[PDB]
């Protein structure tokens, strides 16, 4: 499934993740945007042998079982396909996981260059909430 | 912190019936609002997570609604099992909060604390977390409480990069920290008062499974 702005923005609102733990709303729409692009069914193979799951990029070393990865951690508890549904449910339940560690939201490398300190909230503008 | 007011206090049914309990919330939360089940000092466990989602192993009929502000818990057609005290939970914020309780009065990985079940005021308090059947460097782990009166406090938590949330109640008294090649888990709580007679029980941070928990009481 492939989201509008406004559309997913809605949807993570409903998905409770505006000022989660900390993070405003436009944090998880401009990362989804530079992980995904909006794509719940993105995914990206990696030089070492773990894949980048879903509309957040979730990473099978760490997060989610593929059964390809050699000394995967499987931190979310989760197969890596339920990362894929159309449903932005796991997706979202497993960055919630991931951003209540210390680094929170350092873990993605796309918003750590093109989010982190630019105005996020922008990426709300526009849509009714 | 976010308090959650739950209500009725207690309630009284016929098997059969359905019911709903209600939590509210002194800020918007979203969707970060859990429900438990807890029959008088066992482990709690866990029926709805952020707010309305299902639970594997859980029966149908247990099924949640609302957000910002304003959660409910439904039991349609009450059963008798169904007996015991329910919680809130907020995940949110920082410190993570209980609600009240309500009184139900009806008419593979395993975890398990060790430690003192007597402790002299002003001493330290030393807990183990054994964890059988992963690696701890597979989740994260916290430590809860349940005091005298019922009440619920979630003391904090360690997370895969080795940082640490603590409650600020505990005013900087605690410490949580891994030994990866023992598998296990632990609590320190410095300078302890009687006020910290408790059950404690230690949980993976998801809540899906508990340690059967643990009466520390101090005592002159």
């Known amino acids: 499934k492939v989201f509008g702005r406004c559309e997913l923005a809605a949807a993570m609102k409903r998905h409770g993740l505006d000022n989660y733990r900390g993070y405003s709303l436009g944090n998880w729409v401009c990362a989804a945007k530079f992980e995904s692009n909006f794509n719940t069914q993105a995914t990206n193979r990696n030089t070492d042998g773990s894949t980048d799951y879903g509309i957040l990029q979730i990473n099978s070393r760490w997060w989610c079982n593929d059964g390809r990865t050699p000394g995967s951690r499987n931190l979310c508890n989760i197969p890596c396909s339920a990362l894929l549904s159309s449903d932005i449910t796991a997706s979202v339940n497993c960055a919630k996981k991931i951003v209540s560690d210390g680094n929170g939201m350092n873990a993605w490398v796309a918003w750590r260059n093109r989010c982190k300190g630019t105005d996020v909230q922008a990426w709300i503008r526009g849509c009714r909430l | 912190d976010i308090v959650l007011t739950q209500s009725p206090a207690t309630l009284s049914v016929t098997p059969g019936n359905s019911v709903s309990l209600s939590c509210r919330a002194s800020?918007?939360?979203?969707?970060?609002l859990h429900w438990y089940q807890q029959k008088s000092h066992e482990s709690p466990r866990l029926l709805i997570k952020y707010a309305s989602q299902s639970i594997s192993g859980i029966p149908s009929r247990f099924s949640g609604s609302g957000s910002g502000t304003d959660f409910t818990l439904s039991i349609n057609s009450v059963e008798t099992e169904d007996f015991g005290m329910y919680f809130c939970?907020?995940?949110?914020?920082?410190?993570?909060?209980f609600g009240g309780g309500t009184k139900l009065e009806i008419t593979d990985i395993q975890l398990q604390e060790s430690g003192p079940s007597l402790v002299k005021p002003s001493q330290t308090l030393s807990l183990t977390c054994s964890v059988t059947?992963?690696?701890?460097?597979?989740?994260?782990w916290s430590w809860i409480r349940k005091f005298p009166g019922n009440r619920l406090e979630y003391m904090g938590y360690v997370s895969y990069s080795g940082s640490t949330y603590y409650n600020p109640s505990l005013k900087s008294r605690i410490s949580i920290t891994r030994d990866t090649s023992k598998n296990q888990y632990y609590l320190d709580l410095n300078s302890v008062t009687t006020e910290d007679t408790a059950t404690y029980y230690c949980?993976?941070?998801?809540?899906?499974?508990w340690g059967q928990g643990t009466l520390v009481t101090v005592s002159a």
């Open positions: 059947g992963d690696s701890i460097t597979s989740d994260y």
């Open positions: 939970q907020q995940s949110n914020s920082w410190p993570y909060t």
């Open positions: 949980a993976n941070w998801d809540g899906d499974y």
């Open positions: 800020q918007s939360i979203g969707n970060n």
